């Protein structure tokens, strides 16, 4: 199996229509049961987050999710778990899903199955030490980089690879654009079956999310979890 590195990417959504990664990604993605979209036949959105480190807003993000009773899926790294045990515990205690973003956040395509297995299981090990629980296995490739070998291998390891359909620059600390920037992206890029990828490190990301959920719901959107996405497609 091919180990050519691939960077997950796509032309952004337009006119609130789902985006498309093209035939090559779709075919490859489908081949290993990985996806970047949920059910596009309904006004549904799935919130996911990538957490590499804490910059002080995740608690507010969690309070916001609780307020709207929405279930998030947080993809954590080894450092994040080790550094924020209590946040990992709140995510757990509050009904949220904890995804895998690898322990050291390396370029998995440069790793061996032996290494990949440790990169992933060590995150679960730490999460369990803290929660005593373990979510279904979801993986988001560190740096968004992957390959057929990586997909195949991680799938062989029982992981469901989850990409995204909505993302923007809410992770540059040296240039935190404020509430409006993120809020508008979340409104403009919204489409049915959209899988959002957000970070909780930029200034006001929590308040923009708050307003975004508030308004997206007014527009008739229902927020579902990656577990819900999985269950509903099963049937
Ligand atoms: C912890 C963190 O910020 N993860 C990011 C991920 O969200 C993003 O898609 C990728 C490319 O920008 O780089 C990292 O993997």
Swiss-Prot record:
It holds the Pfam family Polysacc_deac_1. Optimum pH is 7.0. GO terms for biological process: carbohydrate metabolic process; cell wall organization; sporulation resulting in formation of a cellular spore. A divalent metal cation binds at residues 101, 105. Keywords: Cell wall biogenesis/degradation, Hydrolase, Metal-binding, Signal, Sporulation. The record marks 170 as: Raises pKa of active site His. GO terms for molecular function: deacetylase activity; hydrolase activity, acting on carbon-nitrogen (but not peptide) bonds; metal ion binding. Induction: Expression is sigma G-dependent. Disruption phenotype: Spores have no muramic delta-lactam structure in the cortex and cannot germinate. Mutant spore peptidoglycan possesses many MurNAc residues lacking peptide side chains. It comes from the Bacteria. Its EC number is 3.5.1.-. Residues 43-224 form the NodB homology domain. The active site is at residues 50, 199. CwlD and PdaA are necessary and sufficient for muramic delta-lactam production in B.subtilis spore peptidoglycan. Catalyzes the deacetylation of N-acetylmuramic acid (MurNAc) residues in glycan strands of peptidoglycan, leading to the formation of muramic delta-lactam residues in spore cortex, after transpeptidation of deacetylated muramic acid residues. PdaA probably carries out both deacetylation and lactam ring formation and requires the product of CwlD activity on peptidoglycan as a substrate. Is required for germination. Cannot use chitin oligomer (hexa-N-acetylchitohexaose) as a substrate. NCBIfam families: spore_pdaA (TIGR02884). Belongs to the polysaccharide deacetylase family. This is Peptidoglycan-N-acetylmuramic acid deacetylase PdaA. It comes from Bacillus subtilis (strain 168).
